[PDB]
Design a protein around this ligand. Sequence first.
Ligand code: 62J
Length: 188
Amino acid sequence: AQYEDGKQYTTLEKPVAGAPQVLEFFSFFCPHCYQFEEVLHISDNVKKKLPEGVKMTKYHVNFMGGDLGKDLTQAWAVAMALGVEDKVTVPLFEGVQKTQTIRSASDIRDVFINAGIKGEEYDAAWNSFVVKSLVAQQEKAAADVQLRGVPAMFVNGKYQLNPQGMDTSNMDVFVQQYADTVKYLSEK
Ligand SMILES: COC(=O)[C@H]1CC[C@@H](CNCc2cccc(-c3ccsc3)c2)CC1
């Protein structure tokens, strides 16, 4: 077939009941994740091709970066709670991997302040139980698929994208194959 299990996607042996329709995982420490987001814009090109009524969920993970990796999962919870993902994703990636100026929780907070989130608003979110719940949700979704590597994307708890199996040497063609595969899975 044109789309083949083991080719552009694999099939989870233990499918996850009640999972998000389209679930992406990343770390701000993850070099391929920087490429996926900052250079290929995978999330955006996937989102822009999802069928009507299909939503995209994107969560951070703890298993890279030790202490600071957990702080970033908490900050991503703050970004989701405040709805400022589109303001902070670029400076967080660049702060961790390009300028390497993010070395502490305070340096993460500086990115939000520079992006125009008020200090009071950030600190309130950071310490909130709504954010603790969002951290818990991020951790559970990753645990449910026994996640040990990023970037990763899952569709309906059943299928895992396999970009290494998208047989093209062109990066924009790669991006659109990836997006077209998510659309195909979402329709399955
Ligand atoms: C987690 O899996 C991965 O990260 C790998 C990454 C590269 C690989 C190459 N096949 C597609 C392709 C062709 C040409 C260029 C680029 C490209 C440009 C900036 S980053 C990657 C990708 C497939 C997936």
